Amino acid sequence: FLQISGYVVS
Amino acid sequence: VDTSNITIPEKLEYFINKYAEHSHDKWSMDKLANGWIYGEIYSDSSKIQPLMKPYKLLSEKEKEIYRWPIKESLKTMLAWGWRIERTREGDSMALYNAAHGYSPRAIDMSNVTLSRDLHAMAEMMAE
């Protein structure tokens, strides 16, 4: 629910 | 991993609001296979609960049951200073997959890939 819900972490 | 304090940003308030909206679909999918369904009032014969209402219409007598065990993960990330950034896209899983026309929208389970940061974040929160 967090990752591929319009989310990027870098 | 000891954690002391945190000064979180104002953006981190709608994650918990959007949690229950998507978790009630899996709760309905869990309890619809059984003999549980919406009704009038809690009773053992009709198999009714007070939770069985829409995800927005959750009573004050129980709300923290959904919202408790999420935010204590983000302390271990954000206190040391891990990132929770976001793109400009937002709603993605809407396209990619009973009062008020309710029914579940099952997210796929047989598709996943992991890397350094992804396995790190998953193991951090589950830890």
Cβ of A3 within 8 Å of Cβ of B90? The answer is no
Which residues of chain B does A10 touch, with a Cβ-Cβ cutoff of 8 Å? 83, 85, 117
Tell me how far apart the alpha carbons of residues B93 and B105 are, in angstroms, rounded to a whole number.
10
Scan for tokens 């609960």, then name that residue. Answer: B49
Check CB contact of B19 with chain A, cutoff 8 Å: yes
Check CB contact of B123 with chain A, cutoff 8 Å: no
Q: How was this structure determined?
A: cryo-EM
